[PDB]
Design a protein around this nucleic acid. Sequence first.
RNA 1: GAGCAAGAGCCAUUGCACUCCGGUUUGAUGACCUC
Lengths: 95, 96, 115
Amino acid sequence: RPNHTIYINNLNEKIKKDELKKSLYAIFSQFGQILDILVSRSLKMRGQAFVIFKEVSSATNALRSMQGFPFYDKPMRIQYAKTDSDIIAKMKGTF
Amino acid sequence: TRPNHTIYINNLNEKIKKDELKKSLYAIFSQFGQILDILVSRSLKMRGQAFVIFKEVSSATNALRSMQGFPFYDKPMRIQYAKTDSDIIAKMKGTF
Amino acid sequence: VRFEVPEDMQNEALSLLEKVRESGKVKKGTNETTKAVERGLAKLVYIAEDVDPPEIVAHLPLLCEEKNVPYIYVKSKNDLGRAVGIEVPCASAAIINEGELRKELGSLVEKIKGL
RNA sequence: GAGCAAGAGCCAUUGCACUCCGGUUUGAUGACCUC
Ligand SMILES: O=P([O-])(O)O
């Protein structure tokens, strides 16, 4: 169910978080404004992220375009985030 | 236009700081095989450009073919082979 | 401005600023400095004599006195700006940690306690 | 306005490197950023 936020897993776990955030931005800025980028902090939940755009269209183009893109040599699984799963993640430390 | 271990990239976003630029490049391109180095300057003559030094020419070719015109930091990469061997490659050849 | 300060005493205090940035901790600019003082982290504050308008630093002496913090005047704020390592003028600064240059600072404090 | 505490604009350059080389205005008298 479409959202202005995509959820990514199968990210590369041997990548520090700041670099991860920036690289994600580098590859996703093309689809529109990005309000924020969160990466996972737990270990459950080891190679995961949320990218929060402003517009739903941004997220849709991003999902279509980047599905399976070999980011740091691992094709991403990308889907729409469940509603509020990002703010709930940030509110805890799951991130 | 003749295949090289090194690809020359330009039309890059000039606002991106150097270290970030090297790491982002390495994300999108480590995809294609092993990378020996990535060279970036922001001097007048060398800004907006980067050199990616692949270990194998096949890697270079697939990178160039696969990432041509890719919107990197919202700005379409122009890729082409480097005009001449990077020094480390020459050393490997070994000419130099 | 409460009391007069001889030139060499200043020049010394400024040298001590540039040095103390290497081992200690400095808070630069008036809002950071006021905050530092209010939190009782201030070891000693610097006030410039050419601040226009004066209302910017005018409350630092009173506030130091209430929190028992020693304080010294320096002539130029461009000088103070250079001393703390920034590319603009600085109107008031504060040392809140020194480590290496304790006794030097110490010695400057009693010189200030002269008047 | 609160928090933070050092960067932020503009002009010019599309440029083939492997030691390094544009100009300019503004910012601690508070910039980007957060609320
Ligand atoms: O260090 P700051 O000023 O960018 O928060």
